[PDB]
Amino acid sequence: VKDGKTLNDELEIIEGMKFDRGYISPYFINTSKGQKCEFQDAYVLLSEKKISSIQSIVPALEIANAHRKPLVIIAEDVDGEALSTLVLNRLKVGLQVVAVKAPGFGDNRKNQLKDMAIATGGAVFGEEGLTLNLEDVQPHDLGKVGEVIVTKDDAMLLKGKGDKAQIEKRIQEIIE
């Protein structure tokens, strides 16, 4: 229950996975009518660590470009060389890519990223336990979403192509 700005009550239903992190740079906007980045049938690359180097972002973009599919990178932060590479490939050749910060502050951020991985059918990179690296990325390690909408203040993933058994198992783990 929150404050409304109108005279009457309204009910809003937030479907899918929506979190309060927008795009990192404003150059990823492709739909100017709402100032948002909208992709359909997009790959999803999830990183538990920050992406700031060239070698940690080239092969994911090579997979996206070879498969001719949009890429959404959800990480702790994309900055520096990797961010400049993303913006340069976006503006010059027209590469369908967007970069979003990972929501949460602490263990909840890791848990939310793992939930996104299970929902989308991808793998979390840069983790402590398993130590999967962004230099070695295969197409099966990337999640698949039917729809993604990224505005300035929030990101939203719709109809992720994960395994239903994985999702039920994660839900039961959350319940326990």
């Binding site: 080239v58 090579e62 470009n65 060389e81 400049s84 590479t85 340069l88 490939n89 050749v93 590469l95």
Partner: protein, 100 residues
């Protein structure tokens, strides 16, 4: 010694030009210019006469003009010839050659 752009290196110095930095990856991904470091591959364009390591004679440099060489990270002097970048090394600074 062999000259180039009317420039002749003295002693055992070798004048090379660095190979062109790679702008796109093998998967067609464009790279930023500021993220491209100094290219350690070069081709030899000028050679000096050579120092006198032994007594009485001039030792020639181990590289000739046209050799593909691998440069070290440090040890090169910037030289501008007809508004174009070139680098001057010592003969012993050069790590190795690419022979074909």
């Amino acid at each position: 010694g062999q000259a180039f752009r009317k420039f002749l290196p003295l002693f055992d110095r070798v004048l090379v030009e660095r190979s062109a930095a790679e702008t796109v990856t093998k998967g067609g991904i464009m790279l930023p210019e500021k993220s491209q470091g100094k290219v350690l591959q070069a081709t030899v364009v000028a050679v000096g006469s050579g120092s006198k390591g032994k007594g009485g004679e001039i030792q020639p440099v181990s590289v000739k003009v046209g050799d593909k060489v691998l440069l070290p990270e440090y040890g090169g002097t910037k030289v501008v010839l007809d508004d174009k970048d070139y680098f001057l090394f010592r003969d012993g600074d050069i790590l190795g050659k690419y022979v074909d």
